[PDB]
C-alpha cells in the first residue's frame, strides 16, 4: 500500500508509536500507581492486539530505512520469529485482560515488554 | 496517557497517518484498478474502524499543537459533531464491506472521504 519505501517507514513508525502508547499507558496500572478497572484494560488491550499486528506488513521487500536494521530482510525467518513471539505474548496479555486478573496482567505485561526489547536488541538501529 | 502535549500531538498524527493509510489503500479497489476481494476489504475495514476511533482522544484539553486549529477546543461540540459524522460514515463503510458489495463500498467510501475533508476544512491548519 506504499508508493515509496519512505511511506512504509512512516507507516511502521506510526504503527509502532501507537502500539507503544497502548502498551506503555498501562504501566501505572500494572505498578498499582493507577487504579485497575478490568473493563478499561480489556478494551485497551483489544486496541493493542489490533495495533500489534500492523507494523510487520510495513517491512516488506525494498522498504529499508528508518531505524530498521538490514538484518530484518536478510534474516527474514529470525525477524518473523521475533514478531511472532511478540504477538504470541500479546495473546497472553489479551487472555489476562479478558480474565480480569491484575496478577496475570502484570506477568503478561512484563513478558510483552521483554519481547519488545528482544526485537530491538537484534533489529533496531 | 500523554506526559506532555507534544506526546498527544505525536499520537494523533500517528493515529491519523494509520487511519489514512487504511482508508486510502482502498482507492484502487473502489476505482476498479485493483481487484475486489470481499474478505480482504472486510478485514481492512475492520482495522480502519478500530483506527478511526483513536485520534479524537488525543485532542484532550491542553493538547494544542501540530496542525490542529484552536477551534477544536473552543468549539468542542462542533468538533465532536465532525468526528461523530465521520465515525458514523465509517459504520456505513463497515456495513458495505461486511455485505461484500462493491457498489455500496464505493458509495460509502466517498461519504467517508467527504467527511475527512469536511473536518479538515474547519479544523486543520
Ligand atoms: C520486532 C519484531 C519489534 C517488536 C516486537 C517491537 N519493535 Fe519497537 N521497533 C522495531 C523496529 C525495527 C523499529 C524501527 C522502525 C523504523 O523503521 O524506524 C522500532 C521502533 C520503535 C520505536 C520508535 C518508533 C518511531 O516513531 O520511530 C518505539 C517507541 C518502539 N519501537 C517501541 C516498541 C514497544 C513498546 C514494543 C512492544 C510493545 C515494540 N516496540 C516492539 C521492532 C520491534
Ligand atoms: C476531524 C474530526 C478529522 C477527521 C474526520 C479527519 N481528520 Fe485528518 N486531521 C485532522 C486534524 C485536526 C489534523 C491535524 C492533527 C495535528 O495535530 O497535526 C489532521 C491531519 C491529517 C493528516 C496528517 C497527519 C500527520 O501525520 O501529521 C492526514 C494525512 C489526514 N489528516 C488524513 C485524513 C483522512 C484520510 C481522513 C478520513 C479517512 C481524516 N484525516 C479525517 C482532523 C480530522
Residue numbers in the entry:
A (entry chain A), B (entry chain A): 901 to 1025
Provide the authors' own sentences about this structure as they appear in the paper.
All of the tertiary structures are similar to wt AXCP and only salient points concerning the heme region are discussed here. Ferrous structures show the different residues at position 16 to lie over the heme in a similar manner to that of Leu16 in wt AXCP with the exception of L16A where the side chain is essentially truncated.
Cytochromes c′ occur in methanotrophic, denitrifying and photosynthetic bacteria and have proposed roles in protection against nitrosative stress, NO trafficking during denitrification or pathogen defence. Unusually, cytochromes c′ are able to utilize both heme faces (distal and proximal) as a means of discriminating NO from other diatomic gases.
